């Protein structure tokens, strides 16, 4: 049977007791969800190929398992390997034993290695605990380093390979140098224990960790796709998210409905088929109009007895648009075919037509003693041997050179007088090699001039129309499609680009020859994973694919058999962004979630159709419907009816904004030179960039100092919270700092500075050139500033950003905040206890979230991670050789002598220089946007907290009443009050009432009606009072408007 290696394939490529930070490694890694071959019974275990990687894991009830034997032939013929367990000590033998079909010491031979260590462990992990044991092994050969891993992983589900995780660290090794291909299992069998076999791959893990130096995370690349969030996405505990995976991307889609069906013509045939060509002397010279041959059909034709090409391989057929082609036709001698080469040596090669010392695309020849040679012998051609003007290349000397000097004894007139260069050539159809007339031309090309768009006269989006071979062996290394094109033409031949080097194809007068580039098959990979945590079901998106075309590298299937990797699913769908191999496309249209594209999302509930349905969509698949924000909540036409609120609701959020880097300067020289005479002198010689960069870095340093200061010096002088915390019935209980607890952060803030993932990319971390100068305001100084913040916010008024803090209550502070938002302070003087209950209870439950909601603060953590990646990609770029023999400095200083050392170190520096300048420019972009963030943080604090701004969707949604600041390591949290009326109940009104012939309108109120009477109330609070002349005004007379009615005023 075939069982996935769900979490099997992850291990330690080398010595790393890492902790909780993100790093990648590139070695021979077993694919995830890799199907494993079972061998439980004979029905013992057939021999298998090594495949440059194999996996094993034992699931035994009791101690049975013996060792194995490794080698090419597993026989005395070839150097082999042995693995034996003595239950006392393990040994490894590289020995050559006679191959026994069934095992253990058949014949000891050539035992070059010996080793003793503790035996590889076994049972009572299988029996004593009443569970059993899963003993994973990792077998690898890289540079002969026999990479042996193991541990125990007890499980109780022996049905198949279950979930659950364990690390993998090395055991022993040998410096073999063996070429390992095949292997056997030894044990001293219809029903033997169950195990696995998983074939590995040379891949690139990223490794994340716990705090105890143990593995926790890695992913797959072009297999599992579930646990292929990538081969690098840093976590088993991924969330529901679209994760681009690998560069074997896609094949095409459908398109809009225009269609070519137009072919044109042009008489090129004479250029090669004019059965009466010119003599080799008078090499005929034609260039022709828009008409070509499918030089693939010229390549694969046996009509040409000589298909010789100087410069272009004949397998580069489609993208050939060549600017100028000069056709030069001429007869040949039977033995001159080899002599056809640019810059050759001989009589004719430079004395009848010379191709110069440069490439000549293709020169095409074939014997034609049938169409030319006659029974009397074709009799009409010549050859000029060595008695002429030496023939500069591309010269048709049609001159009759009777003499060269007319007097010299060499040729002249003395001695030889009747000599003449025009020596004629003859032959016969049946003569043999040496004088066989091959039909020979010259095809010389030009370059560097072809701006156009009509190297595409083309159309017909398709799936594909022809066999798998050579659709488009261009878009170099090639792939594509072929079909027919549709346009008219003009005298140019052979060249154009669609736009600016988008070379497409060479058009037909007869053939098919289409690209508009027929695909490089396309770009897109968008594997869906909902997370290993709450799911184990997978699907894959293929952006911009015809789903009938088996998207990835059409039915590549050169990999392990996997329903997703081996694309054959009928559970598919076609979006705008291509096929959805693991889909169950539905039209339910819930809220959007993990997105696919153009309006396709996922993540339904666990009982959509079946009990087997899970929280992840459509167990064993993934359903991706059409996106919607939901449905309508239409609002209607009120002429004067007032759906007036009598109650209201509030909620509280989290607002998260970084306010600095992890303050970092970079001594540019020390970063680069590392206090080295070589680089110190070398950079003193080289430019002044580093000085400017260090200036910029000091600027950003004092910048985050200024950001911290501005976010935490909005008030000139500090205000401690009140001693007794009994604010007009409004409990807070969580945001005031600790009165005497260590670090004096708020209870919320204690829980934050601790709940922040105290690794926080682990970044307690200066290595080289680095530094972390700590900020101006110490963490406790930020805390004290938050104290000032709450002191002003709930203790002084609208005014602690307005200078000195006052000594004023919050009962009446909230009274004046009601008073100044447009609804009188009747609200709390009625309901101070009730609004206090709502407000403080909500604020309390919000901290329950901020305690449970890890990663909901993903922006400060995100920026910590971006600086982490900044320094990390920085150091890995420091680990970029960039033109030397290695990325190290000192070795290649000493490995090579003075000139080589200095030039290689020059390259090393210049490259790492450029990398640092790119880092600092990206860091300055980040620093400008995070300056914007710091100004925005100070601005939220100021506007929303220090007073109360009118800003909308800046601190909450809508009714802005006040606001609250918080703190963090390098960012800040924020929460601010959001007020919303509710309970709409309809009530009639009117812009005017007729009474005593005058028009009556209110000052602050509206003429509300309850069905038969009319009152004046406010428009977020329905308070019934009689309409009189003390709270209203009367003026003029009833104007022209809809709604004049009775019920006069008092």
């Amino acid at each position: 049977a075939y069982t996935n290696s769900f979490t099997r394939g992850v291990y330690y490529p080398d010595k790393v007791f890492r902790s909780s930070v993100l790093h990648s490694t590139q070695d021979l890694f077993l694919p995830f969800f890799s199907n494993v071959t079972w061998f439980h019974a004979i029905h013992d275990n057939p021999v298998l190929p090594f495949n440059d990687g194999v996996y094993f894991a034992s699931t035994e009830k009791s101690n049975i398992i013996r060792g194995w034997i490794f080698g090419t032939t597993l026989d005395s013929k070839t150097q082999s390997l042995l693995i034996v367990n003595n239950a006392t000590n393990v040994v490894i033998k590289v020995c050559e034993f006679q191959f026994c079909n069934d095992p253990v010491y058949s014949s000891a031979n050539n035992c070059t290695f010996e080793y003793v260590s503790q035996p590889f462990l076994m049972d009572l992990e299988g029996k004593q605990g009443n569970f059993k044991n899963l003993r994973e092994f990792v077998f690898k050969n890289i540079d002969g380093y026999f990479k042996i891993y193991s541990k125990h992983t007890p499980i109780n589900l022996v049905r198949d390979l279950p979930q659950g995780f364990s690390a993998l660290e090395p055991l022993v090794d040998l410096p073999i140098g063996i070429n390992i291909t095949r292997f056997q299992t030894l044990l001293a069998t219809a029903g033997a224990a169950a195990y696995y076999v998983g074939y590995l791959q040379p891949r690139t893990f990223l490794l994340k960790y716990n705090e105890n130096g143990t593995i926790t995370d890695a992913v797959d690349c072009a297999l599992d796709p579930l646990s292929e969030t990538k081969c690098t996405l840093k976590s088993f505990t991924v969330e529901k998210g679209i994760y681009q995976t690998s560069n074997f991307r896609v094949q095409p889609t459908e398109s809009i409905v225009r269609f070519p069906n137009i072919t044109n013509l042009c008489p090129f045939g004479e250029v090669f088929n004019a059965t009466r060509f010119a003599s080799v002397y008078a090499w005929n010279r034609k260039r022709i109009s828009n008409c070509v041959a499918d030089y693939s059909v010229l390549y694969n034709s046996a009509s040409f007895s000589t298909f010789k090409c100087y410069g272009v391989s004949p397998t580069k057929l489609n993208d050939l648009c060549f600017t100028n082609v000069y056709a030069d036709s001429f007869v040949i001698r039977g033995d001159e075919v080899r002599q056809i080469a640019p810059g050759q040596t001989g009589k004719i090669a430079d004395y009848n037509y010379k191709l110069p010392d440069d490439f000549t695309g293709c020169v095409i020849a074939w014997n034609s003693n049938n169409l030319d040679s006659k029974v009397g012998g074709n009799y009409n051609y010549l050859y000029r041997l060595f008695r002429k003007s030496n023939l500069k290349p591309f010269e048709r000397d049609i001159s009759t050179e009777i003499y060269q000097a007319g007097s010299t004894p060499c040729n002249g007139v003395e001695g030889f007088n009747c000599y003449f260069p025009l020596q004629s050539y003859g032959f016969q159809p049946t003569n043999g090699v040496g004088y066989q007339p091959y039909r020979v031309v010259v095809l010389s090309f030009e370059l560097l001039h072809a701006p156009a768009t009509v190297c595409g006269p083309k159309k017909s989006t398709n799936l594909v129309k022809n066999k798998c071979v050579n659709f488009n062996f261009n878009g170099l290394t090639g792939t594509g499609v072929l079909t027919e094109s549709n346009k008219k033409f003009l005298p140019f031949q052979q060249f154009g680009r669609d736009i600016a080097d988008t070379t497409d194809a060479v058009r037909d007068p007869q053939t098919l020859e289409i690209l508009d580039i027929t695909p490089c098959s396309f770009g897109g990979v968008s594997v869906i994973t909902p997370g290993t945590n709450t799911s184990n079901q997978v699907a894959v998106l293929y952006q911009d694919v015809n789903c009938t075309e088996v998207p990835v590298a059409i039915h590549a299937d050169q990999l392990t058999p996997t329903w997703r990797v081996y694309s054959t699913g009928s559970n598919v769908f076609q979006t705008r962004a291509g096929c959805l191999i693991g889909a169950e496309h539905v039209n339910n249209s819930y809220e959007c979630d993990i997105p696919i594209g153009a309006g396709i999302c996922a993540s339904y509930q666990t009982q959509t159709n079946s009990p087997r349905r899970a929280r992840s969509v459509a167990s064993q698949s993934i359903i991706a419907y059409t996106m919607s924000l939901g449905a309508e909540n239409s609002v209607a036409y009120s002429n004067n009816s007032i759906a007036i609120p009598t109650n209201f609701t509030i909620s509280v959020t989290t607002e998260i904004l970084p306010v600095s880097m992890t303050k970092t300067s970079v001594d540019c020289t020390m970063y680069i030179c590392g206090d080295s005479t070589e680089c110190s002198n070398l950079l003193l010689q080289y430019g002044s960039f580093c000085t400017q960069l260090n200036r910029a870095l000091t600027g950003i340093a004092v910048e985050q100092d200024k950001n911290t200061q501005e976010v935490f010096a909005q008030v000139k002088q500090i205000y401690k919270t009140p001693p007794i915390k009994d604010f007009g019935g409004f409990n807070f209980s969580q945001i005031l700092p600790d009165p005497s607890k260590p670090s004096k952060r708020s209870f919320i803030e204690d829980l934050l500075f601790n709940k922040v993932t105290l690794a926080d990319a682990g970044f307690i971390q200066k290595f080289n050139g680095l530094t972390v100068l700590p900020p101006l305001l110490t963490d406790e100084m930020i805390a004290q500033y938050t104290s000032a913040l709450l002191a002003g916010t709930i203790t002084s008024g609208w005014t602690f950003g307005a200078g000195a803090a006052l000594q004023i209550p919050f009962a009446m502070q909230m009274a004046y905040r009601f008073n100044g938002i447009g609804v009188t302070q009747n609200v709390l003087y009625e309901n101070q206890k009730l609004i206090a209950n709502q407000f403080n209870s909500a604020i309390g439950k919000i901290q329950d979230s901020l305690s449970s909601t890890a990663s909901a603060l993903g922006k400060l953590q995100d920026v910590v991670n971006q600086n982490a990646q900044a320094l990390n990609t920085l150091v890995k770029q420091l680990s970029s050789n960039f033109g030397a023999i290695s990325s190290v400095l000192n070795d290649i200083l000493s490995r090579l002598d003075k000139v080589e050392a200095e030039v290689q170190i020059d390259r090393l520096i210049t490259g790492r220089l450029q990398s640092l300048q790119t880092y600092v420019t990206q860091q300055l972009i980040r620093a400008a946007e995070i300056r914007a963030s710091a100004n925005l943080a100070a601005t939220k604090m100021s506007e929303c907290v220090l007073g109360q701004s009118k800003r909308v969707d800046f601190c909450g949604k809508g009714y802005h009443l006040m606001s609250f600041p918080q703190s963090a390591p390098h960012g800040v949290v924020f929460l601010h009050v959001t007020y919303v009326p509710a309970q709409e109940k309809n009530f009639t009104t009117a812009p005017a009432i007729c009474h005593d012939g005058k028009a009556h309108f209110p000052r602050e109120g509206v003429f509300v009606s309850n069905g038969t009477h009319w009152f004046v109330t406010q428009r977020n609070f329905y308070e019934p009072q009689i309409i009189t002349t003390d709270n209203t005004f009367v003026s003029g007379n009833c104007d022209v408007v809809i709604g004049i009615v009775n019920n006069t005023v008092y």
Partner: nanobody
Amino acid sequence: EVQLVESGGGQVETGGSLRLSCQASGSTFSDYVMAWFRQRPGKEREFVATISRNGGTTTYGSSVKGRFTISRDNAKSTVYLQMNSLKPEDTAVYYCYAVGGDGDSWGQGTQVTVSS
């Protein structure tokens, strides 16, 4: 329309003379160099004579050369080869060979017979 139609050739008894004409009917004749060629039955073809482009130089054969007489006429655009001084060694079909433009130029091939 530059297709060379050869003419003038025909039966000639030994000791006579013949005028030879050849036309690229509807296109140029003048500055194409003329070079006739004799092909003997049972033997190999042999160089006879030719002309220059300018017309001023009637560059005849290597041996005794005054036998053959050549000229160009613009007014009718064909050769005027006044053959003379026969030997029985000229019974052959000849080639117009207007080497200008396309060198080995032909398309009919006119035959002159040097009869007895």
